[PDB]
Amino acid sequence: SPIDSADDLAKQTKIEYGAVEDGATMTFFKKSKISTYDKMWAFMSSRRQ
Amino acid sequence: SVLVKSNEEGIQRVLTSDYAFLMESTTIEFVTQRNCNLTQIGGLIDSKG
């Protein structure tokens, strides 16, 4: 689907994503347990290389 | 059920059943260079020396 929802990023795995290494984008996504943000942290840390 | 004492019994289990075995990196390279019925999935998820 068109990815206008933030849950659509958790739905797909084709369109990959990254962020600048700030703790607001990395540490805040790591903790502060939201399930779609858990998916975001899982795809960021699993594709950290 | 999925806990394997050895390496090659896991090789027979991934060869026979609907089972996925986890090896580190180099034995994966050895069995993919050796056996043409097996393949690896994804990238290296850690950096063990």
Swiss-Prot record, chain B:
Family label: Belongs to the glutamate-gated ion channel (TC 1.A.10.1) family. GRIK2 subfamily.
Function: Ionotropic glutamate receptor that functions as a cation-permeable ligand-gated ion channel, gated by L-glutamate and the glutamatergic agonist kainic acid. L-glutamate acts as an excitatory neurotransmitter at many synapses in the central nervous system. Binding of the excitatory neurotransmitter L-glutamate induces a conformation change, leading to the opening of the cation channel, and thereby converts the chemical signal to an electrical impulse. The receptor then desensitizes rapidly and enters a transient inactive state, characterized by the presence of bound agonist. Independent of its ionotropic glutamate receptor activity, acts as a thermoreceptor conferring sensitivity to cold temperatures. Functions in dorsal root ganglion neurons.
Residues bound to L-glutamate: E24
Gene that encodes it: Grik2
Portion of the full-length sequence here: 715 to 763 of 908
Posttranslational modification: Sumoylation mediates kainate receptor-mediated endocytosis and regulates synaptic transmission. Sumoylation is enhanced by PIAS3 and desumoylated by SENP1. Ubiquitinated. Ubiquitination regulates the GRIK2 levels at the synapse by leading kainate receptor degradation through proteasome.
Annotated localization: Cell membrane; Postsynaptic cell membrane
Misc: The postsynaptic actions of Glu are mediated by a variety of receptors that are named according to their selective agonists. This receptor binds domoate > kainate > quisqualate > glutamate. It does not bind AMPA without coexpression with GRIK5.
Glycan attachment points: N37
Name assigned to this protein: Glutamate receptor ionotropic, kainate 2
SUBUNIT field: Homotetramer and heterotetramer with GRIK5. Tetramers may be formed by the dimerization of dimers. Assembles into a kainate-gated homomeric channel that does not bind AMPA. Can form functional heteromeric receptors with GRIK4 and GRIK5. Can form functional heteromeric receptors with GRIK3. Interacts with DLG4. Interacts with NETO2. Interacts (via C-terminus) with KLHL17 (via kelch repeats); the interaction targets GRIK2 for degradation via ubiquitin-proteasome pathway.
Tissue: Highest expression is found in the olfactory lobe, piriform cortex, dentate gyrus, hippocampus, granular cell layer of the cerebellum, and in caudate-putamen.
